C-alpha cells in the first residue's frame, strides 16, 4: 500500500528498524509495518503492569488506596515521582499514575512486586489473550534492548490489539478502564512522539518508552474529532548501543498514518 511505502522510506532514512501497528476501530482494519517482529518494549511495558493491578482491584476494591513504602533501596535510575516520597508511602494508584504519566521506574518495580514478579505481569497478558508480550526483568535492566534478545519484548500487532482491549474494549471493568484512559491522557512524556505527528485537535493518550540501542517507542489511543478512535503503536530501535533517541521518527510515522 501507499502508507507502507512511505513507512519503508521513513525507516530507510532513519537507519533503524521501525515497527508500526494501527487499528482503526471504525472498520477494524489494520495497518502493519513489521507488525510481527519483536521489539524491546522498554517503558511501554508499564501499561501492562498498571492494567494488571487495575484488574486485581476489580476484586480487591480498596487495592488502589493501599499505601506502599518507598525506601531508599527501592530507588533505581529514574524516579521523578518516587524520589519525592522517599521514606514515605505512595498508594498503588499514585504508583500507577507515576509509572504511566512520568515513566517512573521505581513505581514500575513496585507494580511488578505487587503482581508477584515479572511472571505476574506476563500472566495478566496471557489472561487477556496476549500470547506475545513477555516481561522478564525489572527496572532498569528490562531496557537493555539487545538486538535479537527476546526478553521484555512484544510485537506491534500484539501490543496494538492489547492496548485496544485495555482502553476501548472490556478486558478491564468499567471503572478500571476509565481510570486507565484518564492516566494515559495525562501522560507528560509524549509531546515529541506520536502526538507531534497528529492534528492538534485530536486527543491522545499514550505511553512512551526508551532504552538502549536508541530504542524509542510510543503506544497510543487516539480519539479523532467526529471519528472512531484509533490505536497506534510505533516501535523503533537502532543498530548502535549508544544511539540517540529518535522521537521524530515516531512523530513522522504517526503523520504518515494520519495521512490515510
Author numbering: 28 to 287
Q: Any passages from the paper?
A:
In order to establish a reliable and accurate method for determining the influence of temperature on the resting state of the CTX-M-14, and XI structures, initial data were collected without triggering a reaction. Five structures of CTX-M-14 were determined at 10 °C, 20 °C, 30 °C, 40 °C, and 50 °C, as well as five structures of XI at 20 °C, 30 °C, 40 °C, 45 °C, and 50 °C. This systematic normalization of all experimental parameters permits a direct side-by-side comparison of the structures and consequently allows to directly assign temperature-induced structural differences. For CTX-M-14 a shift in the ADP distribution and pairwise Cα-RMSD can only be determined above a threshold temperature (ca. 50 °C), corresponding to its in-solution melting temperature. Clearly, both the CTX-M-14 as well as the XI sub-datasets assemble into temperature-specific clusters, emphasising a coherent conformational space that corresponds to environmental temperature. Thus, mapping the torsion angle deviation onto the backbone of the protein structures highlights hinge regions with particular flexibility. In CTX-M-14 these are residues 52-54, 193-196, 226-231 and 251-255, while in XI the region around 25-26, 126-129 and 206-210 shows the largest torsion angle deviation. Taking the general trend into account, the combination of the much higher unfolding temperature of XI in solution, and the gradual increase in ADPs with increasing temperature suggests a different temperature response mechanism of the hyperthermophile XI compared to the mesophilic CTX-M-14. This indicates that the respective response in conformational variability reflects an adaptation to either a mesophilic or a thermophilic temperature optimum, respectively.
To demonstrate the versatility of the method, we have employed two different model systems: a mesophilic enzyme with direct biomedical relevance, and a thermophilic enzyme with industrial implications. Klebsiella pneumoniae CTX-M-14 is a monomeric enzyme that catalyzes the hydrolysis of penicillin-, cephem- and carbapenem-family antibiotics. Streptomyces rubiginosus xylose isomerase (XI, EC:5.3.1.5), is a tetrameric enzyme that facilitates the interconversion of aldoses to ketoses, for example D-xylose into D-xylulose or D-glucose into D-fructose. Here, we show for both systems that a modification of the environmental temperature modulates the underlying structural dynamics as well as the enzyme kinetics.
